[PDB]
Amino acid sequence: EAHIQMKAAALKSAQSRLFGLDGGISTQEENTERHTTEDVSPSMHTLLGVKNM
Amino acid sequence: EAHIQMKAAALKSAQSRLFGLDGGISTQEENTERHTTEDVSPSMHTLLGVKNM
């Protein structure tokens, strides 16, 4: 009885977690898009439908 | 995908020309006109209707 009470008092209410933080860090997608000197910006190739006035 | 992006970036917007400068250089007409000692000038034969005063 003493050992059981000691074990119960030591363990308390310790929740058991089956997993931790996943090791897969990359949550985005690889950017396979090309970059060329013809681009108007590092994020865009052309401004196709844009109309100035 | 990597090969397609590489090809697209390398080709860019290269316009394809079906023709180059034409090899036919002579754009004028052959001068079949004669030249004679009777001519008043290398470019003219007579001054027919010219009236002096």
Side-chain angles (χ1 to χ4, degrees):
Chain A
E1 164 91 324
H3 177 247
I4 282 180
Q5 298 273 16
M6 272 196 288
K7 181 186 191 198
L11 291 168
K12 279 140 152 96
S13 38
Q15 175 82 102
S16 47
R17 277 275 297 204
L18 182 59
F19 290 99
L21 193 75
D22 203 88
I25 312 305
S26 197
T27 57
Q28 296 175 350
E29 60 187 343
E30 208 211 2
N31 192 27
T32 36
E33 190 76 6
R34 77 225 171 268
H35 190 16
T36 315
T37 321
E38 298 240 12
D39 295 20
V40 308
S41 149
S43 71
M44 305 231 185
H45 300 270
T46 68
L47 313 174
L48 204 59
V50 182
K51 290 200 85 98
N52 185 86
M53 153 255 206
Chain B
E1 164 91 324
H3 177 247
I4 282 180
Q5 298 273 16
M6 272 196 288
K7 181 186 191 198
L11 291 168
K12 279 140 152 96
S13 38
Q15 175 82 102
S16 47
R17 277 275 297 205
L18 182 59
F19 290 99
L21 193 76
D22 203 88
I25 312 305
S26 197
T27 57
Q28 296 175 350
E29 60 187 343
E30 208 211 2
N31 192 27
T32 36
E33 190 76 6
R34 77 225 171 268
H35 190 16
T36 315
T37 321
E38 298 240 12
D39 295 20
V40 308
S41 149
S43 71
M44 305 231 185
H45 300 270
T46 68
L47 313 174
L48 204 59
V50 182
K51 290 200 85 98
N52 185 86
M53 153 255 206

